[PDB]
Design a protein around this ligand. Structure first.
Ligand SMILES: [Fe+3]
Ligand SMILES: [Fe+3]
Ligand SMILES: [Fe+3]
Ligand SMILES: [Fe+3]
Lengths: 336, 336
């Protein structure tokens, strides 16, 4: 038995009683799981490109269930026993591959107090090539066209359109000072109560301005863009990945202002309609404040409360930097 | 093989490799699951009281993992394949028992438009005895002492201390108008950014004023109080339970002001320190506004977008009313 996206699409078409029958059959469930381990070996041991993309298509389908409002026809379907087993196996493989690129020395050299840890992490981030990647630093200001921006935006639907729920997942069970800061960030994502300022709505207008429609996305989303979006989902939805998540989305806010300023300046230079980039324009100043509060009010208190979590936050940071590097190199490659 | 709380506590003590070994063994996992079906039969077919309380002790332990910040020693432990199978089986049994008390006529008679649906639901709520239960209506104003309030508050640690995360889970994937209202409710739960006004912090002070400490809670929490708290967890954490959740927490906000006004007035009459009930005092006016916005901005738009969800919201409402009735009758019974 083999597992792929269409197989999981078929599961998701089952009726509630068919789901109850599948859930009761630990023989069909063992087979599903062994099929997942086989797909994982192909993707990461053999590094078969089509298997890796199939694995991320499967994860993306599952996370779509975790993050999306359920449709009426599905409300009775108990999908957790099977879909969580699939996710745990493929996730476990995605994350072991990320950690194979991370050395013990990178994540153990840190000062064991909050304010000091922040200086260290910013230096560590600044040393990584993704922090000044040529896609933003060289390609965008000198070459990017409408069609380049359209292709680029298609890749970015993996992350920005779900920041609000990533934050809502992350703050579950968080210590009070960390929860307060994440809460305020979430409330900003929701326009501080004003629908016209909701960040995902403003991001949808950028997609509108360039016709980044659902066919274009599905046809053009790169495998590294899928992995990026799946990594963010994976880390946000498990409580045990919280500290990795703190590092991952901490790096995310920190890099936005430099990246978006290069994007908006070129967008104007090539005459594109400026209300199209209200999202990126706004985030230049918003995420300067988000990044500052994230370091000072999430990362520093976590390290001060238990310095052992500094290692988890560093891992999460490096997972974001490495995956962003692979995604940006792949993007720049396709754009040349 | 039998399953109970201590068995699941032992799972949660396993190291990451022991978890990986358990997850790979679909024979041990089939046994765990059959042990869950057996516990479920005892709890709900035989209605053995100790089995029902054991089932809710197991669920409460699992939800504690879902809602609580993970400890450092546990960050590497892949608990989802087993704990989600346990939860799906015991949850499925808890919810079938709730639905056995709900007739098709109760949840199908509703008008298929939003504003009309709200009037109907309020009438349906007002017809249920939990909406004017003698614990609040008769016992509290005439008899409640310090020790009664202490016992009562111990039961209420099942729900109020996690409203913020219940709301954060619920709004995942919600349609925009519904998400905005849930978001604003969450931001109120977080003191609108002011730590002294965070609702769970103010609720902790009420517990402090009466010495509702962790031993007292563990020794005194009633089985119906556990079921109440597990029902709220169950509905909030699955996307497919969203509309039931909307009905369940809609009833919750709606009933708070009448209930809390009876509590605070007696609290003052018996001379208890009034800063102890800052939480309940505040919520008399806050949840009047929360309930109004929940009907107008969550329930009415959901029904107008797809009237089929009116049946789910009604189920969730009746699940809250029925479970509250059983919990309040059990409480009043123990207090006499
Ligand atoms: Fe944003
Ligand atoms: Fe931000
Ligand atoms: Fe509240
Ligand atoms: Fe409220």
């Amino acid at each position: 038995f083999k597992i792929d996206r269409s197989v999981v699409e078929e599961f998701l078409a089952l009726d509630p009683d068919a789901w109850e029958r599948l859930n009761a059959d630990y023989t069909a469930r063992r087979r599903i799981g062994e099929a997942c381990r086989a797909l994982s070996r192909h993707a990461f041991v053999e590094e078969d490109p089509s298997a890796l993309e199939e694995l991320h298509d499967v994860l993306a389908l599952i996370y779509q269930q975790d993050f999306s409002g359920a449709p009426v026809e599905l409300l009775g379907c108990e999908t957790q026993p099977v879909l969580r087993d699939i996710a745990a196996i493929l996730e476990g493989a995605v994350l072991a591959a990320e950690l194979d690129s991370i050395s013990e020395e990178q994540i153990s050299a840190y000062p064991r107090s909050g304010k000091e840890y922040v200086h260290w992490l910013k230096r560590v981030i600044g040393e990584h090539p993704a922090a000044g990647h040529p896609f933003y630093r060289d390609f965008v200001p000198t070459r990017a066209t409408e069609g380049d921006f359209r292709f680029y935006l298609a890749q970015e639907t993996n992350l920005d359109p779900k920041f609000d729920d990533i934050l809502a997942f992350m703050q579950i069970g968080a210590a009070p000072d960390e929860k307060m800061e994440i809460a305020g960030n979430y409330w900003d994502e929701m326009g501080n109560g004003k629908p016209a300022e909701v960040h995902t709505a403003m991001f949808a207008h950028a997609l509108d301005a360039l016709d980044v429609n659902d066919d274009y996305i599905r046809r053009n989303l790169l495998p590294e863009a899928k992995a990026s979006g799946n990594l963010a989902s994976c880390l946000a939805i498990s409580r045990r990945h919280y500290y990795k998540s703190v590092g991952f989305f901490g790096v995310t806010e920190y890099l936005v202002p430099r990246r978006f300023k290069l994007v908006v300046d070129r967008w104007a230079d090539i005459g594109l309609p400026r209300e199209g980039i209200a999202y990126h324009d706004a985030h230049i100043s918003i995420d300067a404040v988000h990044a500052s509060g994230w370091f000072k009010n999430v990362i520093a208190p976590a390290v001060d409360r238990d310095p052992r979590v500094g290692r988890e936050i560093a891992v999460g940071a490096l997972i974001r930097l490495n995956s962003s590097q692979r995604y940006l190199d792949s993007l720049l490659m396709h754009l040349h």
